[PDB]
Design a protein around this ligand. Structure first.
Ligand code: KP6
Ligand code: KP6
Ligand code: KP6
Ligand code: MG
Ligand code: MG
Ligand code: MG
Lengths: 252, 249, 251
């Protein structure tokens, strides 16, 4: 729990350019762990905001022509500011439009973490999630987080598999979108984040989910979501250490 | 409960072009009944998405000049793909802007279900909800669903009145907007849906509402909403069949 | 509780041009006290809607180029219609982009209530220390009711300044609490372009007392469960609870 303590004390400004289905939830998730979310989308204020921010989330969930050039521009402004970017290529394998855009973005800007499910990361690189993550790491030289039944993180010389969470998470819209935000919350302006911050980010989210789903007042996916936020807000070190399941670790 | 069982097993890709106040709630209500919502608004991906989707919801709740040509373009893409459209002409009677746009949309594309309240449907056509629904059906030759104190569905030669639900539903924003999305979830790519699918869609939503409002942890409109989602998620055949209150006119 | 009773009965149409993070919550908060929220953003329908509406909220939380000209246009349509505007200059102090826009808006239209935190109101007047002093300086510049939210809230309208001391710390941990409060204030205007300070005190007090009561509920387990409870509490709030809890001081 080292990084989450710091988020609660320092309240890191976390800029989110995210999709319209999950903006509120993302912001509430970030507030619950003690970050300071800001959903700024205007390239006109990116330079001023990014000087003082700790990370940027770019999530293309509801990509449209209105967003494309603005996303490219703010990614460049982030790179020039030294602001780390968490990129979520939502449903990139579902259309050529999203594929072509994600290729353009990743040619145009360096991101610090690419986060997606196996199908999304596979689609970016053109099979085990670990193999897909390592291939993506070799192509982008950027931390890769692949969410799934077990989560996989590849960063630097390590690959790790994590095994926490609840099935109710799949039934809440934007769970993995909120995870992108949480990961941005853990970066503290490090453009090459320590794998330990990414492990903590993913573990905090998934452990909170596990605990929320066991709460006696969790009656389904509607009641789960408020509980998940409560649980993120209250999560303590004892619970984190008792529950964390980090299942394999591979050093290159 | 035939169709709901199929939603839960097949997880139908349900495209929703909806308004900015209700996107999250709509996606969560669709996820709760087992559908796979996708809020795609880019005409550039409509052809790919629609080929594999089961329905499209078009809801004009926050219509602006940024949306108008895109909505027309995607509705045409949907027709070409055989993807059925559910159209919600939100607040159409409140402005000439919305009236003109809904007229344009309905001259540009064939829709599969038109859903609104009595005042919205009346404004489309220009006193009883049943009469209004039957007049609209005669104009558009498209299933009409009028939500209200009692709901009315008219499809082909049948008209039905349903009498389930809760007053709390009006106090949760986008209830009816979510209903539009639930209806889209029950279409399974049928451009002329069976009246039984529409009856089930409306009935599942309303009965879930009724049951959520009776829950001992429902303390008002704020706790009602998460309960509604739980109740949609858990709704079973037994409860459906015990509670459903339907009449053929 | 006077004005809240009228909201419950009259169901005032409350137009909200607000930010994308808080639309749904704002709308639900307005529904819970009995208002009729409408998130209309198209200038093409503003004249027709505004003729029948009771207030407009303008909140610039997620300002972009797509919004700028539209906001200016609707604000002018509101003035012409006699529709009172509640303006929330979110994060104005965080960029020159927002500062320039808020200066343009307030040179282009007359608003009826300006609501923000101390740092937001300060940035408005600086770019023209105590929250009371800030509120009075802003009132002098704009001749418009000022509401400054904070640990204690401040309201300045005409010759009166009031400090209110209700609420809960969980409100800060729910996104868009104060954004919703902008909406609630709009709900309490009833087409009065110079609202009585009493309406503003009630609007702020209803919200903060409901927050206080929600946070005491035995089912409140944190900021996730708090938000549904806040809505329930707004729905149920009664005069007995309001009069027992309200903590107000005239400066
Ligand atoms: C639902 C839905 N549709 N779209 C396009 C997105 C990004 C979502 C949320 C996924 O969790
Ligand atoms: C609230 C509100 N405003 N607008 C324009 C819409 C469609 C809503 C939700 C209605 O349930
Ligand atoms: C979070 C967040 N980001 N932005 C830009 C806005 C207006 C918010 C909601 C603050 O309550
Ligand atoms: Mg993803
Ligand atoms: Mg409708
Ligand atoms: Mg403010």
């Amino acid at each position: 729990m080292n990084y989450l303590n710091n988020i609660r004390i320092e309240n890191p400004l976390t800029i989110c350019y995210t999709n319209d289905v999950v903006k509120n939830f993302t912001a509430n998730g970030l507030l619950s762990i003690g970050a300071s979310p800001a959903m700024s989308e205007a390239p006109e204020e990116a330079e001023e905001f990014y000087k003082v921010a700790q990370a940027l989330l770019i999530n293309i969930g509801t990509l449209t022509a209105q967003n494309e050039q603005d996303i490219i521009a703010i990614a460049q402004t982030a790179n020039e500011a030294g602001l780390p970017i968490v990129f979520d290529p939502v449903a990139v394998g579902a259309s050529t439009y999203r594929k072509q855009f994600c290729k353009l973005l990743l040619k145009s800007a360096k991101v610090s973490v690419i986060k997606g499910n196996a199908s999304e990361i596979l689609a970016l690189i053109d099979l085990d999630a670990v193999t897909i993550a390592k291939k993506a790491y070799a192509i982008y030289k950027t931390a890769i987080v692949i969410t799934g039944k077990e989560d996989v993180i590849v960063q630097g010389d390590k690959a790790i598999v994590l095994a926490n969470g609840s099935p109710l998470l799949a039934r809440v819209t934007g769970a993995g979108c909120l995870l992108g935000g949480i990961i941005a919350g853990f970066l503290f302006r490090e453009t090459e984040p320590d794998i330990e911050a990414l492990i903590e980010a993913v573990s905090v989210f998934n452990i909170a989910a596990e605990v929320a789903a066991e709460n006696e007042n969790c009656g389904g996916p509607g009641t789960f979501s408020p509980l998940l936020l409560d649980t993120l807000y209250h999560l303590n070190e004892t619970t984190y250490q008792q529950r964390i399941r980090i299942q394999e670790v591979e050093e290159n």
